[PDB]
């Protein structure tokens, strides 16, 4: 079957792959859709180590073709997902405390195990969360990483209704972060990006304020217009956004780091201490987070911006991603 | 009366002052003693703006000599304190939510209002927390800032009993943080400093592990020996400790920033995100935090290491502090 495979020179080989038979607890999905995440870009670029040979993809939606021995959580015909959180150990300090994505034995689709950017994908059944009936597959692909991650990030931000949240980076994740923050958590939102087209879309979807941080001083403007944001979620792919977020929140405010540029942020210590700032990393979401995130999309509370592409376009898509030419998500369509 | 006043060239002049009359809600303290905090050093060096002319000190313990109009919270004869949190507004998003030290109209003793390093001090009665009867004045002075700050920091760290907490900087604050962490919160403690003599004190007081971060790679050792600390409290006066703390915690761990070096810390973004790290600033403690911190010292659960000095020694003390020669706290003794 055809798969997106990472190459040694950091490109994608759209090539032939043959899957092994199933083990106990596994299921085989015939894939319908797989979103392209910027994490796929980091992976293929070698940012998290050399993963030449891995099949990419962890916004995968597929239909169960076969189940392996012992499988009761899925049956043939079910629509299920292939997310970054592909499998946790189920029995550790993280897994049993409601923090399973931090499992130190975690397997991650499109990184440490073959992902869903291929015609077929093997999943661990109890970890392939089902898609609810009212949600179309292309939209569901976006929720499978972009959506769940930002739903969870906003949850973790401690933002309360009527409060100001600054969203940095309005791409695949960021646009959905805006929608969750506004439509689900009832926050007021500042949308911040270096790309005017991303900002145009944000305003179109209800961002209360929009700032181009390349031409403007984003933190200063947030402070002037809102009194300082109560929280921030940083989904941008550059350290400057993280640095700006620290200065954009009011005292006691929480910055949630989500973006993964291979860089360091700088945090002024007297600012951190004397203003009681908080900075916290967030990592995708638990299976329950994903279930909840899907249901919001099923009920139309968030609407993923998606465009369908054939698998052959994957290298071109990554160029578009690099160049900031994507509104929302590009979604690989395997449907014949 | 005599007062420690900040000079234009970042020293202290012992100066005669005559205090103004009390206003409504105020009280006059005849001071018994005043601890020297490293914050006094930052203040006099101009790290927080020029405060030439200000009376230093916010580890003050005094006896109420006189009360102004309307005062019922204090009466003549009471022993009360002069802390960093000298007065909050009492009616704002911070003051009413249990976060009063973050009040944006806060007055800080020894910085934005005359402090307690003088023979007399005017306090706002409702904000001058009383000292419990079972606690000697010199010991109480340390709890007034070093103690309440580290009590609150450990509380905020969310360390649970049996868990590992790394304490960076074992000075005036750090030695008390160790005592609170071990004796009150029942944590296992790693003590970390660049000074072997501070570490010896930590070990004497039951630190489970001690590490010299100058001669050893502290984070590596913490990871190796404990699997990574569940939390950290950083009271050190150098950015390297804040940077190391981020690497010394396990995934999901919380670093509580307390020290105030005029520097920035650096946070590797993928580490922050992929390991769900949390970094939060802590700022002294509420009046209730101080009351609780005082009570622990009164019952002997913590025992401040103190040495008494005359007011005339203040510049010398700051030199000892700068040079890393102080152990525990130096306390200005005004007593007869």
């Amino acid at each position: 079957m055809k798969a997106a495979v990472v190459t040694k020179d950091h490109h994608v080989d759209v090539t032939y792959k043959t899957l092994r038979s199933l083990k106990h607890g596994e299921a085989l999905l015939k894939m319908e859709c797989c979103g392209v995440c910027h994490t796929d870009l980091h992976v293929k670029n070698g940012d998290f180590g050399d993963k030449t040979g891995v099949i990419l993809g962890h916004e995968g939606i597929g239909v169960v073709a076969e189940v392996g021995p012992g499988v009761t959580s899925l049956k043939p015909g079910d629509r299920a997902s292939v997310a970054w959180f592909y499998e946790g150990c189920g029995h550790c300090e993280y897994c049993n405390s409601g923090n399973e994505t931090l499992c130190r034995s975690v397997k991650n689709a499109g990184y440490s195990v073959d992902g869903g950017m291929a015609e077929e994908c093997i999943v661990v059944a109890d970890y392939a969360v089902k898609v609810p009936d009212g949600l179309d597959s292309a939209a569901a692909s976006s929720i499978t990483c972009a959506g769940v991650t930002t739903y969870k990030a906003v949850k973790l931000s401690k933002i309360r209704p009527g409060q100001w949240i600054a969203i940095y980076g309005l791409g695949g994740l960021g646009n959905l972060a805006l929608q969750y923050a506004k439509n689900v958590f009832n926050a007021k939102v500042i949308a911040i990006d270096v790309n005017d087209e991303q900002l145009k879309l944000a305003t179109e979807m209800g961002a209360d304020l929009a700032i181009n941080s390349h031409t403007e001083d984003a933190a200063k403007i947030v402070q002037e217009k809102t009194g300082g944001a109560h929280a921030a979620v940083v989904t941008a792919v550059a350290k400057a956004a993280f640095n700006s977020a620290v200065d954009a929140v009011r005292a006691g405010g929480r910055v949630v780091a989500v973006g993964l540029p291979p860089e360091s942020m700088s945090l002024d210590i007297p600012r951190l201490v004397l203003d009681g700032i908080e900075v916290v990393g967030s990592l995708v979401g638990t299976r329950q987070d994903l279930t909840e995130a899907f249901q919001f999309a099923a009920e139309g509370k968030v609407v993923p911006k998606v465009a369908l592409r054939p698998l052959a376009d994957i290298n071109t898509i990554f160029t578009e991603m690099e160049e900031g030419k994507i509104r929302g998500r590009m979604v690989i369509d395997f449907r014949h | 009366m005599k007062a420690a006043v900040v000079t234009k060239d970042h020293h202290v002049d012992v100066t005669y002052k005559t205090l103004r009359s009390l206003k409504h809600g105020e009280a006059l303290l005849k001071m018994e003693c005043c601890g020297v905090c490293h914050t006094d050093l930052h203040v006099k060096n101009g790290d927080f703006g020029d405060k030439t002319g200000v009376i230093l000190g916010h580890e003050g313990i005094g006896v109420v000599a006189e009360v102004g109009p309307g005062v019922t919270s204090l009466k003549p004869g009471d022993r009360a304190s002069v802390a960093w949190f000298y007065e909050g507004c009492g009616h704002c998003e911070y003051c009413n939510s249990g976060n009063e030290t973050l009040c944006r109209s806060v007055k800080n003793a020894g910085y934005s209002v005359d402090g307690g390093m003088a023979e007399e001090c005017i306090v706002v009665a409702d904000y001058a927390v009383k000292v419990p009867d079972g606690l000697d004045s010199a010991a109480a002075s340390s709890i007034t800032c070093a103690g309440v700050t580290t009590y609150k920091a450990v509380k905020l760290s969310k360390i649970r009993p049996g868990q590992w907490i790394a304490i960076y900087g074992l000075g005036g604050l750090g030695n008390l943080a160790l005592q609170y962490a071990k004796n009150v919160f029942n944590a296992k403690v790693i003590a970390i400093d660049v000074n072997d003599e501070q570490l010896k004190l930590a070990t004497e007081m039951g630190a489970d592990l001690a590490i010299n971060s100058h001669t050893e790679d502290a984070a590596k050792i913490v990871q190796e020996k404990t699997g990574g600390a569940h939390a950290a409290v950083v009271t050190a006066v150098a950015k390297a400790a804040f940077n190391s703390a981020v690497d010394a915690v396990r995934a999901g761990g919380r670093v509580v920033a307390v020290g105030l070096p005029p520097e920035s810390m650096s946070l590797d973004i993928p580490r922050l995100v992929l390991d769900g790290i949390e970094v939060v600033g802590s700022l002294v403690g509420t009046r209730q935090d101080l009351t609780e911190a005082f009570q622990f010292a009164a019952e002997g659960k913590v025992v401040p290491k103190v040495a008494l000095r005359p007011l005339a020694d203040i510049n010398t003390i700051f030199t000892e502090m700068e040079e890393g020669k102080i152990r525990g706290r130096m306390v200005i003794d005004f007593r007869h």
């Binding site: 402070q223 007297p270 | 927080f48 944006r104 800080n108």
Partner: peptide
Amino acid sequence: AIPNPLLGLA
């Protein structure tokens, strides 16, 4: 002021 640790306070 904003930010401006401590100095920015009212």
